[PDB]
Enzyme design. Sequence first.
Site, PDB file in Angstrom:
ATOM      1  N   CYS A  92       0.851  -1.262   0.005  1.00  0.00           N
ATOM      2  CA  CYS A  92       0.074  -0.072  -0.005  1.00  0.00           C
ATOM      3  C   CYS A  92       0.684   1.178  -0.058  1.00  0.00           C
ATOM      4  CB  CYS A  92      -0.819   0.009   1.348  1.00  0.00           C
ATOM      5  SG  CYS A  92      -2.204   1.335   1.338  1.00  0.00           S
ATOM      6  N   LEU A  93       0.811   1.770  -0.822  1.00  0.00           N
ATOM      7  CA  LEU A  93       1.765   3.108  -1.306  1.00  0.00           C
ATOM      8  C   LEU A  93       1.118   4.058  -2.361  1.00  0.00           C
ATOM      9  CD1 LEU A  93       4.571   4.206  -0.434  1.00  0.00           C
ATOM     10  CD2 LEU A  93       5.603   2.840  -2.513  1.00  0.00           C
TER      11      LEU A  93
END
Length: 156
Positions: A92-93
């Site tokens: 998750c970025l």
Amino acid sequence: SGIALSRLAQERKAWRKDHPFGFVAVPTKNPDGTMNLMNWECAIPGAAGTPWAGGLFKLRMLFKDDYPSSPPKCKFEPPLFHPNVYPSGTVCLSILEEDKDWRPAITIKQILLGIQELLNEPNIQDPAQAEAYTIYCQNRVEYEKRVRAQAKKFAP
Ligand SMILES: CCOC(=O)CCc1ccc(-c2ccccc2O)c(O)c1
């Protein structure tokens, strides 16, 4: 997809000429043995002087047919303990979301350096897994203990 494949060939050439030391990024093969530029096997080294040091963390990079319109899906294989990695392994970025900070110009090197940076500096605003996030918030010493054990587990 001609557009995706042309760009991925460009990325492969660039990566071989200039990549950060200790990182790996290699396309896989199709069942007929030809190169599959849509699916890469990668590895990110832990940064020296951090709890991640000495680990080599494997992840797969999966490209959609409309790349580089869309970012690749980046998935640690096996999944890692980290506040911003889902239990599935998916990272998750913001640069990895089309609706957030992804830009078509972003390179594979920039993605992998971005993920390495994330490993050593979690984003408390987008928790992706309950356990690592909770420990990070409640006991930083225990968190780093868990990170070092994991780095040892993934020493090459
Ligand atoms: C990819 C060729 O093998 C090497 O370069 C050694 C480092 C390495 C890099 C990536 C992988 C890997 C990464 C994601 C998914 C499956 C893998 O085997 C792996 O098992 C090992």
